[PDB]
Amino acid sequence: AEESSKAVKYYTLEEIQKHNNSKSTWLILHYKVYDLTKFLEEHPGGEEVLREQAGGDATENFEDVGHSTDARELSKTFIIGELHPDDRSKITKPSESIITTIDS
């Protein structure tokens, strides 16, 4: 009648957590929110690879897998929003420090 709205722009860890279905594959990369549902098809690992990560900040993982500057840039095509102040500094800014010392 007289209104409009779209583009998540800013979502909460929960909002993204709710979206973890092949239909609502939402995840957070680096600190933004991307629509995996739009990047489902694509990806070598498959659609799940994204779904299995959809439902929160996948960066924490996507960082280990060590994606390519292309994969990251490509995600910019799915970017629908970003993590709000509800869990920004909670995920925002990637980082990981683990000691690797195995043998098997």
Ligand code: HEM
């Ligand atoms: C929003 C984030 C993601 C995007 C846009 C993305 C994109 C891609 C792309 C383009 C590739 C092909 C090679 C490359 O990395 O450039 C790839 C491969 C892969 N990704 Fe992701 N990925 C994302 C998140 C993840 C997460 C969270 C995991 C782990 C849970 C994951 C696991 C893998 C694996 C195992 C491969 C296959 C390895 C290979 O191609 O040799 N990805 N991803």
